[PDB]
Design a protein around this ligand. Structure first.
Ligand SMILES: *C(=N)[C@H](C[C@@H]1CCNC1=O)NC(=O)[C@@H]1[C@@H]2[C@H](CN1C(=O)[C@@H](NC(=O)C(F)(F)F)C(C)(C)C)C2(C)C
Length: 189
């Protein structure tokens, strides 16, 4: 069974940088999203993330909660996630924590597109650190979570699809599960 998704739906936003749009997670006054949002299509082949981060300013990021634009007032990189500091705290922020899960453990995924929740399903982390998800274009930044009474444990942010059709991603501190890298290059499970 998947967990009810209401607590997470209220945290989902759309993040756009240039022509690249994906999803972000808005907790308190920070938006978390995959750092490859800052890449053009070309950049994704061999990204120098340090240098791409330099050339972006706060106003190059468009963050929208539904129809409301949120002002980005700071940005930083933590491993493979970007943290955007916004001028508005999310009033729907649940009690939450960030946890890193192990193979064999299950969690719920809230698949989102353009910041809009689309569906909920249960996944299990496989021994090679991949998951058999259902993700299309624009699904990056969708999150995985468990619920402990009233507390949402976020454990997964979505980044990529592998050639065999399984999926890989990070925890919410930006560290990949498994030996994967956020580069459009020869990678296999
Ligand atoms: C995020 N919105 C998408 C989610 C993908 C699209 C198809 N299904 C998914 O889960 N992520 C990406 O587009 C990432 C992103 C560049 C390319 N990429 C990939 O997932 C590609 N895969 C790989 O390069 C591979 F095989 F190495 F894993 C793609 C061929 C587009 C499926 C970056 C930065 C990795």
């Amino acid at each position: 069974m998947a967990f009810p998704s209401g607590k997470v739906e209220g945290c989902m936003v759309q993040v756009t940088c240039g022509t690249t749009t994906l999803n972000g997670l808005w907790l308190d006054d920070v938006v978390y999203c995959p750092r490859h949002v800052i890449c053009t299509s070309e950049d994704m082949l061999n990204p120098n993330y340090e240098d791409l981060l330099i050339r972006k300013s706060n106003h190059n990021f468009l963050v929208q909660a539904g129809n409301v634009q949120l002002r980005v007032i700071g940005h930083s990189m933590q491993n493979c996630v970007l943290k955007l500091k916004v001028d508005t705290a999310n009033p729907k922020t649940p009690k939450y924590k960030f946890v890193r899960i192990q193979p064999g453990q299950t969690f719920s995924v809230l698949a989102c597109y353009n910041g809009s929740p689309s569906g909920v399903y249960q996944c299990a982390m496989r021994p090679n650190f991949t998951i058999k998800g259902s993700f299309l274009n624009g699904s990056c930044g969708s999150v995985g979570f468990n619920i402990d009474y009233d507390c949402v444990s976020f454990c997964y942010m979505h980044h990529m699809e592998l050639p065999t059709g399984v999926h890989a991603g990070t925890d919410l501190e930006g560290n990949f599960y498994g030996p994967f890298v956020d580069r459009q290059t020869a990678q296999a499970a």
